[PDB]
Design a protein around this ligand. Structure first.
Ligand SMILES: *[C@@H]1O[C@H](CO)[C@@H](O[C@@H]2O[C@H](CO)[C@@H](O[C@@H]3O[C@H](CO[C@H]4O[C@H](CO)[C@@H](O)[C@H](O[C@H]5O[C@H](CO)[C@@H](O)[C@H](O)[C@@H]5O[C@H]5O[C@H](CO)[C@@H](O)[C@H](O)[C@@H]5O)[C@@H]4O)[C@@H](O)[C@H](O[C@H]4O[C@H](CO)[C@@H](O)[C@H](O)[C@@H]4O[C@H]4O[C@H](CO)[C@@H](O)[C@H](O)[C@@H]4O[C@H]4O[C@H](CO)[C@@H](O)[C@H](O)[C@@H]4O)[C@@H]3O)[C@H](O)[C@H]2NC(C)=O)[C@H](O)[C@H]1NC(C)=O
Ligand SMILES: *[C@@H]1O[C@H](CO)[C@@H](O[C@@H]2O[C@H](CO)[C@@H](O[C@@H]3O[C@H](CO[C@H]4O[C@H](CO[C@H]5O[C@H](CO)[C@@H](O)[C@H](O)[C@@H]5O)[C@@H](O)[C@H](O[C@H]5O[C@H](CO)[C@@H](O)[C@H](O)[C@@H]5O)[C@@H]4O)[C@@H](O)[C@H](O[C@H]4O[C@H](CO)[C@@H](O)[C@H](O)[C@@H]4O)[C@@H]3O)[C@H](O)[C@H]2NC(C)=O)[C@H](O)[C@H]1NC(C)=O
Ligand SMILES: *[C@@H]1O[C@H](CO)[C@@H](O[C@@H]2O[C@H](CO)[C@@H](O[C@@H]3O[C@H](CO[C@H]4O[C@H](CO[C@H]5O[C@H](CO)[C@@H](O)[C@H](O)[C@@H]5O)[C@@H](O)[C@H](O[C@H]5O[C@H](CO)[C@@H](O)[C@H](O)[C@@H]5O)[C@@H]4O)[C@@H](O)[C@H](O[C@H]4O[C@H](CO)[C@@H](O)[C@H](O)[C@@H]4O)[C@@H]3O)[C@H](O)[C@H]2NC(C)=O)[C@H](O)[C@H]1NC(C)=O
Ligand SMILES: *[C@@H]1O[C@H](CO)[C@@H](O[C@@H]2O[C@H](CO)[C@@H](O[C@@H]3O[C@H](CO[C@H]4O[C@H](CO[C@H]5O[C@H](CO)[C@@H](O)[C@H](O)[C@@H]5O)[C@@H](O)[C@H](O[C@H]5O[C@H](CO)[C@@H](O)[C@H](O)[C@@H]5O)[C@@H]4O)[C@@H](O)[C@H](O[C@H]4O[C@H](CO)[C@@H](O)[C@H](O)[C@@H]4O)[C@@H]3O)[C@H](O)[C@H]2NC(C)=O)[C@H](O)[C@H]1NC(C)=O
Ligand SMILES: *[C@@H]1O[C@H](CO)[C@@H](O[C@@H]2O[C@H](CO)[C@@H](O[C@@H]3O[C@H](CO[C@H]4O[C@H](CO[C@H]5O[C@H](CO)[C@@H](O)[C@H](O)[C@@H]5O)[C@@H](O)[C@H](O[C@H]5O[C@H](CO)[C@@H](O)[C@H](O)[C@@H]5O)[C@@H]4O)[C@@H](O)[C@H](O[C@H]4O[C@H](CO)[C@@H](O)[C@H](O)[C@@H]4O)[C@@H]3O)[C@H](O)[C@H]2NC(C)=O)[C@H](O)[C@H]1NC(C)=O
Ligand SMILES: *[C@@H]1O[C@H](CO)[C@@H](O[C@@H]2O[C@H](CO)[C@@H](O[C@@H]3O[C@H](CO[C@H]4O[C@H](CO[C@H]5O[C@H](CO)[C@@H](O)[C@H](O)[C@@H]5O)[C@@H](O)[C@H](O[C@H]5O[C@H](CO)[C@@H](O)[C@H](O)[C@@H]5O)[C@@H]4O)[C@@H](O)[C@H](O[C@H]4O[C@H](CO)[C@@H](O)[C@H](O)[C@@H]4O)[C@@H]3O)[C@H](O)[C@H]2NC(C)=O)[C@H](O)[C@H]1NC(C)=O
Ligand SMILES: *[C@@H]1O[C@H](CO)[C@@H](O)[C@H](O)[C@H]1NC(C)=O
Ligand SMILES: *[C@@H]1O[C@H](CO)[C@@H](O)[C@H](O)[C@H]1NC(C)=O
Ligand SMILES: *[C@@H]1O[C@H](CO)[C@@H](O)[C@H](O)[C@H]1NC(C)=O
Ligand SMILES: *[C@@H]1O[C@H](CO)[C@@H](O)[C@H](O)[C@H]1NC(C)=O
Ligand SMILES: *[C@@H]1O[C@H](CO)[C@@H](O)[C@H](O)[C@H]1NC(C)=O
Ligand SMILES: *[C@@H]1O[C@H](CO)[C@@H](O)[C@H](O)[C@H]1NC(C)=O
Ligand SMILES: *[C@@H]1O[C@H](CO)[C@@H](O)[C@H](O)[C@H]1NC(C)=O
Ligand SMILES: *[C@@H]1O[C@H](CO)[C@@H](O)[C@H](O)[C@H]1NC(C)=O
Lengths: 420, 420, 420
C-alpha cells in the first residue's frame, strides 16, 4: 500500500557551516547532519504512473522557506522608523544621455541619542529631495549575516517513503518504469531566481523540456539542461561599511563612501554553451509540439522589475538584468544558424518579499568589486500564443512563483506512506 | 470507573464559513469539521447524582475564548498612539432637554507620513475639547473582520466521555435518572450578553429556573425559557468608511460622514411572549421558593455601563439598553394580570475587555441602518433580599461573569474519563 | 547500560508561594509540587568512575534560568524611551574627601499624557548634567514583583535516572564507591553571586576543595565549606515609591524622596568562622597541592564592577562590595596565626544581564532599611600563578560564569538513561 500527500518533511544539512550567514543560520537551526548510506534500490516492475506538477511537497518547501524568512525578519531587521524624506543630490557635473542616477548619495537628519537631537548623515537609495518608501520598510542589515543558498535535504518520516522516477525521459503526467524509494534527498539548494536556473541540477542524458499543459500557454515550461550556459556577474560597485551606534533602540548604517565610478552593476552570459543549448532547445521543441516552425525568442513582456528582468541575488542584493541579450535570436526551421554576451544589471536594496506585509532592505552592501560566477541551469518559459499563418512560434520568459523553481528541483520526489 | 474534571476539550465547526470575520477566523483556526454520527445512547440505570454549577469546563471555555480574543488582539488591533486630545463640536444649533451628545463629530491633528506633518482629520467619540481615553486604548478595526458568534462544539478526547443529563426537571444539585455519553456537543454559539440569553438554547418541555443556592441572593438564577420573547434592534446610525493609509506604520480610519440624523441607536422587545413568559416565570417562582408572594421586578441596581444596561453586541459595537422596559411590572399573587415595547439603546466603540490590560475599539462602524433580530432566550437574575412583612419578593437583573452564560449553555456537559 | 548527557530536566517546587515575586512567578509557572518518597538506594559495587565538571546539565540549568529571565523581561520591563539626559545636582553643601556621589537626586522633563507635554520629575541614578545610559536600558520595575531565589528541583524523566556520588572525599575526576539513583533532587536555590556561595549547600564532613585542573591556574577552584561564615548586609538607604501613571503607554516611577542620609549601602562579614575556615582552607591547600608554602590572599585583580566586587543581590538591587576585607591575610606555613569585619557596599539599579542585548533596572527600590543576613557557603577561587623562589602561593577571587556556581551546586547530579 502506497498513500501520498502528507505535509511531513524531515531535513538534512551541515558540514563546516554554522551561524552568521542567514542561510547558514537557517540550515543550522532546522537541519541535522546526514548519513552516507542511502540505498534507494528500485524494485522490479511496480508501476508506470506519475505526475510531478500536482505535488504539495513543493508548496510545503515553499511556505516553509518563506515562514523561515520571516523568522529571520524577527530579531535584527528594522521595520521602522527612519524612512521619511531624503535630501539627495547627484554626482553629475556634466552630462550626456540624461542618465540621472539609480544610485544617489544623500544627506539626512537623524535621531541619534537622547531626545530630539540629530546629526548630518549619509544615506543611499537605489532606484532631488523627498521620495521615501511606499507604506512599508523592513531593513535587514544585522551585524553577523549573509545570504548564500545552502543545501537542504527533504526526507520522509517513519512508515513513509519517497518514490523517485529515475526515468530519463518522462512526459510529466505519465509512464515511468523505474520507481525507487529513498529516505532522504541528496540535498537541494534554495536558489531564488527567475528565467534561468542558477546553480541547481543538470539533466543526466539529454535536454528535457517539461510542461504542465503543453497546449495551455499560461502554464510554465520548465526547460532543464544537460549542460550549463555560463554567466559571470561582476558588480564592481563600492560601498564602505559604517555602522553608527548612537542610540540604544537605534542601529544605523552609513554607506556610500569612496568612489571608483563603477558602471551600474555588471554581468555577462557566456554564449557558446548558449548557442548549442538554444539550438538543441529549438530541436527538442521541434521534436515535441513544434514540428515544422521557425522559433523566435522575444524579451520579457512587461511588469514589475522582478518580472521584466532576470531578478536574482548575488548574496542578498537584488539584481535586475536587461534580458534582451538572452532572448534575441530567430531560429530558422530550415536548418541551424572569441565573443561573449554582456548583460546590464542593477543592484537593489529595497525588494518586496511576501505579500505587502513589508519591503526588505540589505542596507550596508559591504566592500566592493564582488563577482559571482554561475552556471545557467535552466529556463522557465511561457509561450506567446501565436497563429499558424505566421509559420513561426514565439516564446517569452515567464515565471515569478518560486514554487515553479522547486517543481523544477523537487521533480523527482513524492512523499508516500507504507501500509501492510 | 468514571473520573471527572480534565482540562481537555476538543473542538468542532465549519461549513461555509472561512476567514475575515473574527469569529469565522477563530472557528477556522481552532476547529475541524464534525461528523453526523453521534449516538450518545443512555444506558439503563447508572446513577441519579449530578451538579452543573461546579463544572470547570465552563471556566475552561471562558478562559479559552478570552485568550483567543487576545490572539485576535495581536496582529491588526492598535494599542496606540493617537488618543491624546480631541477638538470636538456639536451639531446642535438650537436645543431642548439639554441633550448634548453621545456621538460627536470632531476635528484632529494627525501624524500622517514622514516626520512631524499633520492633516485635519475627522474623529468620532462615543460617550467640547480634550477628554481623550483613560490610560489604555486598543483599536481593533482591521481591513477584513467582523463579529458574529459561531457554533463551537466541545468534545471529549480518547478514553474520555461526557455524561449528559437529559432529565427535563433537574434540581441542579441532584437526582438525574438519564445519563448519556456523547463524544461531541451539538455546537455552542458564543453569545456575549447580560440579563437575557440571545440566540442560545431553549428548554424542551416547560420553563426551568436554576440556581446554585436558592437561599443565597448573591448567587445567580439562570432562568431558561421554553419559548423566545422577541427583540428587534434597529440602530439606524450611519457612518461612512474612510481608511486613510498615509503612513507605513500608521493605519487610520475616518468615520462620521453623511447624516440621516438617526436617534441614538434603537431597539424593541416584543411583549406577548414577554407577557406569558413573565407570568409563567412568576408561576415557576411561586411553585418553587415563592409560595405565596406578589412578585415585583425593578430595574438594574447600578454600576458600570455594562452592569446597568443590557450590554450586548450587534456585530462588534457594544450596545447598552435602558432596561426599565423589561423590569417594570408588579405581578399580583392573587391572580394573573397591537403594542410593542420600545427600548432606548446606545452604541459604544470603547469597551473594557479583560481586566484593564486594555480597552477595545471597533473604530469604523461600516454603512448604516443595521437591524439585528434576536430571540430572548433567557434571564439571568439576582434576588433583592427582602422581608416577609412586605408580603412581596423583588427580583433584579444581575450578571457580568460570562462564565454564568456558559453554565447556562454548558449545563448538560461534564467531561469524564473511563478506566477498566 | 547507562548512557549519559540528555537535555531533559523535570522540575519540582511549591508550598506557600504563588505569584508576584518574579522567582515565585517562575517557580509557579515552571514547576509542579513534589512527593516525599525519594528512596535513591545505592546498589552494592557498580563502579568508581565520575567527572562533575563535564556535566551539560549545568549548561542546561544555566541557559534555562537565563531564558526564563528574558521571559520575565517580556511583559512589564521597559526597554525605552526616557533615558536621554539628566539634570542632576548634589546634596553636598560643604565637603571633605571629594566624595561627589554614587546616588544623585535629579530633575527631569517627562512625557506624561497627550502630545508633547512635560512635567518636572524626580529621577535617581546610581553610579551634574546629561550622562544617560550607554546604548541600552530595560527598566524592570513592575507593579507586583520581587527577587528572592526559590528552590528548584531537577528530575530525570521516564526511563532515565540520575547517579549521585555520595562519597565525602571526591577528587572530582575520579574514584567514587557509592552511586545512587534519585528521581528528583532535594531542591536547588538559584543564588546569583560571585566569590562566596550565599545560602547554598554545606559539606557533610570536612571542608572540600575542588578544581577542574589543579595545575591550570585559569581553571576555577570551588571551595566548599562544612561550616558557614557569617555575612550580614544592612543597606539603610531609603526611597519612597511613587508610580505616576500619567499616560496609557507610559508607566513612570519616582524615587528619591525623604532622607536619613544613609551611608552608601552597608555590609558585614562575621570573622570567627572566617578565621577557622580560612585556616582550615590553607590546611586543605597544604594537604593537597601546597605542601610547604605560606599562603597569601590578595583582593580582586580588576575588571568590570561585577568582577572586582562581590556582586550579589539583596532582593533585586545589585550590590558591589569592596572585597579587601575578605582577602587581606597572609597565612604562615610555619604554624597557624568581640570584633567584626565591616564591608563597604553599593547598590546598583543598572546591571548588564545577558550579552549586551540590554541593561536591567530595578527602578523603584521600595521602603528603606533592608538587611539581608546570609551564610557564607563558599569560595570560588583562581590561583595567581607564582614562583617557587617566593616560597609562597597567592590566591585571588575569580568567577563570573554562574555555571560554575551550578557545578558548585549540581556537583552530585548527572542525568543518565537505562537500557536492557
Ligand atoms: C418598536 O415598537 C414600536 C411601537 O412600540 C414600533 O414603532 C414604529 O416605528 C416605525 C418605524 O418608524 C413606524 O413606522 C412608520 O410609521 C409612520 C406612521 O405610520 C402611521 O401613519 C400612517 C399614515 O402615514 C399609517 O398609514 C400607518 O398605518 C399603516 O400601517 C398599519 C400597520 O402597521 C396598517 O394597519 C394601516 O392600514 C396603515 O397601512 C396603510 O399605510 C401604509 C403605508 O404607511 C401602506 O403600506 C398600507 O397599504 C396602507 O395604505 C400608521 O398609522 C409612517 O409614516 C412611516 O412610513 C414611511 O416611512 C417608512 C420607512 O420608515 C416607509 O417604508 C414608508 O413607505 C413611509 O415612507 C413614505 O411616507 C413618508 C411619510 O409618510 C415619506 O416621508 C416617504 O418619502 C414615503 O413617501 C411615500 O409614501 C407617501 C405616502 O403614501 C407618498 O406621499 C410618497 O409619494 C411616497 O410614495 C413608517 O412606516 C411606526 O409608525 C411605529 N409604530 C408605532 C406604534 O408608533 C416599531 O414598529 C417597533 N420596531 C420593530 C422593529 O418592530
Ligand atoms: C558635457 O559637455 C561636453 C562639452 O563640454 C559635451 O560634449 C559632447 O560630447 C558628445 C559625445 O562625444 C558629442 O556628441 C557627438 O557629436 C559628434 C559631432 O557632432 C558635430 O558635428 C556633426 C556632424 O559631424 C559629422 O560630419 C562631420 C563633417 O562635417 C564629420 O567630420 C564628423 O566626424 C561627423 O561625421 C553635427 O551634425 C553636430 O551638430 C548637430 O547637433 C547640433 C546640436 O547639438 C545641431 O545644432 C546641429 O544642427 C546638428 O544637428 C555637431 O556639430 C556627432 O557626430 C555624434 O553623433 C553621432 O554619434 C551619436 C552617438 O554618440 C549618434 O546618436 C549620432 O546619430 C551620430 O552617429 C555625437 O552626437 C558632442 O559633439 C560633444 N559636444 C561638443 C560641443 O563637442 C557633452 O555633451 C557633455 N556630456 C559629457 C558627459 O561629455
Ligand atoms: C572601496 O572602498 C573600500 C573600503 O570599503 C576600499 O577597500 C580597500 O581595499 C584595498 C584593497 O584590498 C585596500 O588596499 C590595501 O590596503 C592595505 C592596508 O593599508 C592600510 O594600512 C597601511 C599599512 O598597513 C600595514 O600596517 C598596518 C598596521 O599599521 C597593518 O594593519 C596592515 O596589515 C599592514 O601591515 C597604510 O599604509 C595604509 O595607508 C596608506 O594609504 C593611505 C591612503 O589610502 C594614506 O593616507 C596613508 O598615509 C598610507 O599611505 C592603510 O591605512 C595595504 O597594506 C595594501 O597595500 C599593499 O598592497 C598593495 C596592492 O594591493 C600594494 O600596492 C602596496 O604596495 C602594498 O603591498 C593595499 O593598499 C584598502 O586598505 C581598503 N580600504 C579600506 C578603507 O579598508 C576600496 O579601495 C574601494 N574600492 C573601490 C573600487 O574604489
Ligand atoms: C429652539 O428654539 C425654539 C424657538 O425658536 C424653541 O421652541 C420651543 O419648543 C418647545 C418644545 O416644543 C416648546 O416647549 C413647550 O411650550 C409649550 C407652550 O408653553 C408656553 O405656554 C405655556 C402655557 O401654555 C398652556 O396654556 C396655553 C394658554 O395660555 C395653551 O395655549 C397651551 O396649549 C398650554 O395649554 C406657558 O406656561 C409657557 O411659559 C412657561 O415657561 C416660560 C419659560 O420658558 C416661563 O417664562 C413662563 O412663566 C412659564 O413657566 C409658554 O409661554 C408648553 O405647553 C410645553 O410644556 C408642556 O410639555 C412639556 C414637555 O414638552 C412638559 O415638560 C410641560 O410640563 C408641559 O406639559 C412645552 O414647554 C416652547 O414653547 C418653544 N418655544 C417657543 C418660543 O415657542 C426650542 O426650545 C429650541 N429647541 C428646539 C430643538 O426646538
Ligand atoms: C566643610 O567646611 C568646614 C569648615 O567650615 C571644613 O572643616 C574641616 O574639617 C576637617 C575634618 O574634620 C578638618 O580637617 C582636619 O584638620 C585638622 C587640623 O588641621 C589644622 O591644624 C593642623 C595641625 O594641627 C595639629 O597640631 C595642632 C597644634 O598646632 C594640634 O592641636 C592638632 O590637634 C594637630 O595635632 C595643620 O597642619 C592644618 O593646616 C594644614 O592644612 C592647611 C590647608 O588646609 C595648610 O594651609 C597648612 O599649611 C597645613 O598643611 C590645620 O591648620 C588636622 O589635624 C586633620 O588632619 C589629620 O587627619 C586627617 C584625616 O582626617 C589626615 O589626613 C591627616 O594626615 C591628619 O592625620 C584634618 O585635616 C579641618 O581642620 C576643618 N577645617 C577647618 C577650617 O576647621 C571641612 O573641610 C568641610 N567639609 C566638611 C563636610 O566638614
Ligand atoms: C523612608 O521613606 C519611607 C516612605 O517610603 C518612610 O516610611 C515610613 O515608615 C515609618 C515606619 O514604619 C512610618 O511611620 C509610622 O507611620 C504610621 C502611620 O502614620 C500615618 O498615619 C497616622 C495615623 O494613622 C492611624 O490612623 C490611620 C487612618 O487615619 C490608619 O491608616 C493608621 O493605621 C493608624 O491607625 C498619622 O498620624 C501620620 O501622620 C503624622 O505624621 C505626619 C508627619 O510624618 C504629620 O504630618 C501628621 O500630622 C501626623 O502627625 C501618618 O499619616 C504611624 O502610625 C506610626 O506611628 C506609631 O509608631 C511609632 C513608632 O514607629 C510611634 O512613635 C507612634 O507614636 C505610633 O505609635 C509610625 O510613625 C511612616 O508612616 C512611613 N511613611 C510613609 C510615607 O509611609 C520612612 O520613614 C523613611 N525612612 C527613612 C530611613 O528615612
Ligand atoms: C490544457 O489547456 C488547453 C487550453 O489551453 C485545454 O484545451 C486542455 O484541456 C488543458 N488540459 C488540461 C489537462 O486541463
Ligand atoms: C566566466 O568564467 C567561466 C569559467 O570560470 C567561463 O567558462 C565563462 O566563459 C566566463 N564568462 C564569460 C562571459 O566569459
Ligand atoms: C532590455 O529589455 C527591455 C525590456 O525589458 C527593452 O525595452 C530594452 O530595449 C532592452 N535593452 C537592450 C540593451 O536591448
Ligand atoms: C492642531 O491644531 C489645533 C488647532 O486647530 C491646535 O489646538 C493643536 O495644538 C494642534 N496640534 C498639534 C499637533 O500641533
Ligand atoms: C446558601 O446561602 C445561604 C446564605 O445566603 C447559606 O445559609 C447556605 O448555607 C448556602 N448554601 C451553601 C451550599 O453554601
Ligand atoms: C432606565 O434605567 C435607568 C437606570 O439604569 C433609569 O434611571 C431610567 O429612569 C430608566 N429610563 C427609562 C426610560 O425608564
Ligand atoms: C527640559 O528643561 C530643561 C531646563 O530645565 C532643558 O534644559 C531641557 O532642554 C528641557 N527638555 C525638553 C524636553 O525640552
Ligand atoms: C592542566 O593545565 C596545565 C597547564 O596549566 C597542563 O599542563 C595540564 O596538561 C592540564 N591538564 C589537562 C587535563 O588538560
Amino acid at each position: 500500500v502506497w498513500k501520498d500527500a502528507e505535509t511531513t518533511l524531515f531535513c538534512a544539512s551541515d558540514a563546516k557551516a554554522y551561524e552568521t550567514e542567514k542561510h547558514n543560520v537557517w540550515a543550522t537551526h532546522a537541519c541535522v547532519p546526514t548519513d552516507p548510506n542511502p540505498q534507494e534500490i528500485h524494485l522490479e516492475n511496480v508501476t508506470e504512473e506519475f505526475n510531478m506538477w500536482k505535488n504539495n511537497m513543493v508548496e510545503q518547501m515553499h511556505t516553509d522557506i518563506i515562514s523561515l524568512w520571516d523568522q529571520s525578519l524577527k530579531p535584527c531587521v528594522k521595520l521602522t522608523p527612519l524612512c521619511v524624506t531624503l535630501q539627495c543630490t547627484n554626482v553629475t557635473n556634466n552630462i550626456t544621455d540624461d542618465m540621472r542616477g539609480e544610485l544617489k548619495n544623500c544627506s539626512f537628519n537623524m535621531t541619534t541619542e537622547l531626545r530630539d537631537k540629530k546629526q548630518k548623515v549619509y544615506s543611499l537609495f537605489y532606484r532631488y529631495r523627498l521620495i521615501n518608501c511606499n507604506t512599508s520598510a523592513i531593513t535587514q542589515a544585522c551585524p553577523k549575516v549573509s545570504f548564500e543558498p545552502i543545501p537542504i535535504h527533504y526526507c520522509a518520516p517513519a512508515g513513509f517513503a519517497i518514490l523517485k522516477c529515475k526515468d530519463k525521459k518522462f512526459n510529466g503526467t505519465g509512464p515511468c518504469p523505474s520507481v525507487s524509494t529513498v529516505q532522504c534527498t541528496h540535498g537541494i539548494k534554495p536558489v531564488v531566481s527567475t528565467q534561468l536556473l542558477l546553480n541547481g541540477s543538470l539533466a543526466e542524458e539529454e535536454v528535457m523540456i517539461r510542461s504542465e499543459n503543453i497546449t495551455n500557454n499560461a502554464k510554465n515550461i520548465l526547460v532543464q539542461f544537460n549542460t550549463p550556459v555560463q554567466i559571470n556577474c561582476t558588480r564592481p560597485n563600492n560601498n564602505t561599511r559604517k555602522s553608527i551606534r548612537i542610540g540604544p533602540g537605534q542601529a544605523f548604517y552609513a554607506t556610500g563612501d569612496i568612489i571608483g565610478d563603477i558602471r551600474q552593476a555588471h554581468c555577462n552570459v557566456s554564449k557558446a554553451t548558449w548557442n548549442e543549448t538554444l539550438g538543441k532547445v529549438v530541436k527538442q521543441l521541434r521534436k515535441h509540439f513544434g514540428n515544422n516552425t521557425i522559433i523566435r525568442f522575444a524579451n520579457s513582456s512587461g511588469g514589475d522589475l522582478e518580472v521584466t528582468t532576470h531578478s536574482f541575488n548575488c548574496g542578498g542584493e537584488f539584481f535586475y538584468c536587461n534580458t534582451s541579450g538572452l532572448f534575441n535570436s530567430t531560429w530558422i526551421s530550415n536548418t541551424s544558424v572569441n565573443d561573449s554576451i554582456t548583460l546590464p544589471c542593477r543592484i537593489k536594496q529595497i525588494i518586496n518579499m511576501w505579500q505587502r506585509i513589508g519591503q526588505a532592505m540589505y542596507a550596508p552592501p559591504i566592500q566592493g568589486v564582488i563577482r559571482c560566477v554561475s552556471n545557467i541551469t535552466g529556463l522557465i518559459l511561457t509561450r506567446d500564443g501565436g497563429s499558424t499563418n505566421s509559420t513561426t512560434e514565439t516564446f517569452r520568459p515567464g515565471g515569478g512563483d518560486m514554487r515553479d523553481n522547486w517543481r523544477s528541483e523537487l521533480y523527482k520526489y513524492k512523499v508516500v506512506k507504507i501500509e501492510p
